[PDB]
Ligand binder design. Structure first.
Ligand SMILES: COc1cc2ncnc(Nc3ccc(F)c(Cl)c3)c2cc1O
Ligand SMILES: COc1cc2ncnc(Nc3ccc(F)c(Cl)c3)c2cc1O
Lengths: 184, 184
């Protein structure tokens, strides 16, 4: 709860001012001393890693919940997941803002990254099925996510501004992202 | 010289804070009275449109000075422009951040979109031949540039973070942008 509050405050602080966000700020917003933040989190790096798992869990519950398992077609499954992630982001703007910054960032542990993929096994298989091999590689895995997230976050800004054409933005965003990242 | 000072200070504020950037902060960092900004630019929208054409004009000159007209394959020609844009963004981080927020904004006038299009008549004509028709359309043109600027800024962020792989990021980002935006 005091942990939960620090994770809420960390989502708000990071989305607004990115991962350079002050542990001191988070604590005051948390309604505690900085010393409490460090009791709960040994490092700012530990809190970033813990927060990313927190937000990715929150996002995958969304995605898991919406996944019609009758579907097998790779393109069809990914579109579904695209639609889940976008709608998750319209509904939680700060969560989307912090998670996109966290996902690309250098300070994620390998243990953090493994566990995230555990959270939705269906995506890891789909990416192994569909994505250009270069973006599955250790060297450019982060680059391909950063490209997915850029196109998703663009698709989101246009969607919010223009509820009227939101469906076209999502359709056009997804097909753009699919050509970008998958085998031709 | 008050105007050129302000244009530069508007660049730094809108890069940091998006178009939400306060005219109060712009004038102070510009070294002038907020009242004085308003004399040069009667409204915020006014400042936004002028700043946009200013950055667009600086970037297009760079792409024109660097363009090798001995390049005959339309794909290689665009890679060259992408290279110069990325090169420009890495040399000028605040200009690219700012030009992206401005380019994808409701606040730009049709007359601004006209003057901006004509800064490079042949880069314009190139897109007319090469880009997916939906992304040339009245409704979705802003979204196409939106998808392009997101792919380019992510490319610039990875090149800047990890200059060892700078070349492959640029190269990968171009091919992803190419499959994203263009006719097949
Ligand atoms: C087509 O390839 C991808 C599809 C994806 N779908 C959904 N999520 C992806 N990645 C992703 C990775 C990390 C994240 F935090 C978020 Cl919010 C999204 C995807 C990454 C891909 O490379
Ligand atoms: C092939 O598709 C495009 C290629 C582009 N190349 C270079 N520049 C484009 N637009 C652009 C590039 C830089 C900018 F700052 C702005 Cl505001 C717009 C392009 C837009 C496209 O849709």
């Amino acid at each position: 709860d005091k942990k939960q509050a620090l994770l809420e405050a960390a989502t708000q602080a990071i989305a607004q001012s990115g991962i350079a966000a002050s542990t001191a700020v988070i604590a005051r917003n948390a309604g505690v001393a900085e010393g409490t933040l460090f009791r709960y989190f040994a490092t700012k790096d530990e809190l970033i890693n813990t927060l990313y798992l927190h937000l990715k869990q929150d996002l995958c519950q969304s995605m898991i919940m919406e996944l019609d398992r009758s579907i097998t077609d790779a393109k069809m499954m990914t579109r579904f997941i695209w639609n889940s992630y976008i709608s998750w982001g319209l509904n939680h703007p700060a969560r989307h803002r912090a998670i996109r910054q966290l996902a690309v960032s250098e300070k994620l542990t390998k243990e953090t990254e493994q566990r995230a993929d555990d959270m939705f096994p269906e995506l890891r298989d789909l990416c192994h099925r569909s994505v250009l091999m270069v973006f599955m590689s250790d060297e450019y895995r982060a680059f391909g996510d950063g490209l997915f997230l850029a196109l998703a976050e663009t698709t989101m800004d246009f969607a919010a501004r223009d509820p009227a054409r939101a469906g076209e933005y999502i359709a056009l965003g997804f097909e753009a992202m699919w050509r970008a990242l998958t085998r031709e």
